[PDB]
Symmetry: C2
Subunit: 299 residues, 2 copies
């Protein structure tokens, strides 16, 4: 069985703050004596292009208001790093978790804590897509909502700060160094993301989960090797497959090689007409190998 | 957009404890000076039918171990209430949230905090089906994982304790009074749940969500009234629709009457062939009216 789940949010909830500059309000993340938030908070109200260098030069500290659960924090200084601000505050968060900062790569799964006015409202798992966007559920005010992962030793990896929604509905964020994923602009514009590719590593994991649930009507006895599959994937909207050996735990429990699943992807690429696999009517790239193994075996 | 999300888990994480009796380990929920957990924890190791009254009669308090983050709570007394135990402990949980106990009805959405050995591992939203099961993701050791909702005023509604996985893969739990949802047996058996019905209320909410995203190819021009739909619903595996008055906010913005959606359900009852609605190839009863309203408008 497979369910997209989030890792527990409690340690991240204790870091979320409300950041206001003038009338503009969004979310930030308070670790130690630093609050990180999108620099959009200092943008002037205007319909023309934002000159953030100018806004930063004219910025005054007294225009900031930063609070955690309605308790206001004093602002000591502010510096700008790409698309984020680093706000130094006059006291440290006593609930700062053990943490690091990590930049995601396409195909990485992570957790979003959707926040509004410094208050978390929801949490869900997501995948960074090949076009460097995610499919979230955000409404007005979610800017600065953090993305995270929790390592096995309990270390929180801070990896995402929500920045903008594109005209297509795709969501764009930055890492905590201020680099926007996919090099999108952090202000309204007419930019469009590139076509989404199916995450082949995730589809292989999905088909192994199907096999382990007794669903195998689709299984191909043909084999396609990695080099051949990667050339096919180029022409058919799929990513390369990264490797084969990481699936050995599932290859052994089933009797099925990764190369058989690569052939099966090519066989199922257009549709199931009109059967289903684990309830899905087309191939699913929602679940990583790590998620399948964790949810099926606890590893 | 429509995404299944969970409400943040921090306030519930601080209530999960590890409950051990002999060698048997599961999860409990620590509120005030009471820990509630499934009575399965006192079951003998055997393949015969469990007599829980006899297990309770032979129980010894010193066989219990109850711990939070590796520190042990002194057990003072234990009573059995249906399928749960209420363990009195000598310390109160200083992180007990404002809370009530609520019994779910089919069609209700709630959050599951999946836990193992008293430690939370995942959080996800589920919906109670008409056969009083949920489709979660659990492996061995998840017994006692709590289900909750958080009210607008901050009150946590505790509504579910995970009990068993059926042969089908569906999951069964109890409420905090010890009543098993659907009155399934809380021990290994061959029980088969009745077939699920489509939750018509949730399908209506889902079609309102599609309208608000410009997805309208499926809208019937004609209408069916509630009485006519409910007659059809019996014959075709759908629940009766509750009322038309609830959807007025959706009926306003769209602005489509519930009767037009009920007619659309009748036409879309068979497949979409081969179109899709918000990515789905069939009607989705995953989302309640409250969820759609909260996710679209923050209310």
């Amino acid at each position: 069985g497979l369910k997209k789940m989030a890792q527990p949010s409690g340690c991240v909830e204790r870091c979320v703050v409300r950041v206001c500059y003038g009338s503009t309000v969004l979310n930030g993340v308070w670790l130690g004596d630093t609050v990180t938030c999108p620099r959009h908070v200092i943008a002037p109200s205007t319909t023309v292009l934002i000159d953030y260098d100018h806004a930063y030069s004219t910025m005054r500290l007294h225009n900031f208001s930063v609070s955690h659960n309605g308790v206001f924090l004093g602002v000591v200084g502010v510096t700008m790093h790409g698309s984020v601000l680093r706000i130094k505050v006059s006291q440290s968060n006593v609930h700062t978790p053990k943490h690091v900062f990590k930049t995601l790569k396409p195909g990485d799964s992570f957790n979003i804590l959707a926040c509004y006015e410094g208050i978390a409202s929801g949490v869900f798992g997501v995948n960074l897509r090949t076009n460097f966007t995610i499919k979230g559920s955000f409404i007005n005010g979610a800017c600065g909502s953090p993305g995270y992962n929790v390592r096995n030793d309990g270390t929180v990896e801070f990896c995402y700060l929500h920045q903008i929604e594109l005209g297509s509905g795709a969501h764009v964020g930055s890492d905590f160094t201020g680099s926007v994923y996919g090099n999108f602009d952090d202000q309204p514009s007419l930019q469009v993301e590139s076509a989404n590719l199916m995450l082949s590593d995730n589809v292989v994991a999905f088909l192994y989960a199907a096999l382990l649930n007794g669903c195998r009507w689709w299984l191909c006895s043909t084999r396609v090797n990695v080099d051949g599959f990667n050339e096919w994937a180029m022409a058919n909207g799929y990513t390369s497959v990264s490797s084969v050996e990481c699936y050995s735990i599932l290859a052994a429990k089933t009797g099925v090689s990764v190369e058989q699943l690569l052939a099966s992807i090519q066989h199922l690429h257009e549709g199931f007409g009109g059967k289903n696999i684990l309830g899905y009517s087309s191939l699913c790239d929602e679940f990583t190998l790590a998620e399948v193994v964790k949810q099926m075996y606890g590893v």
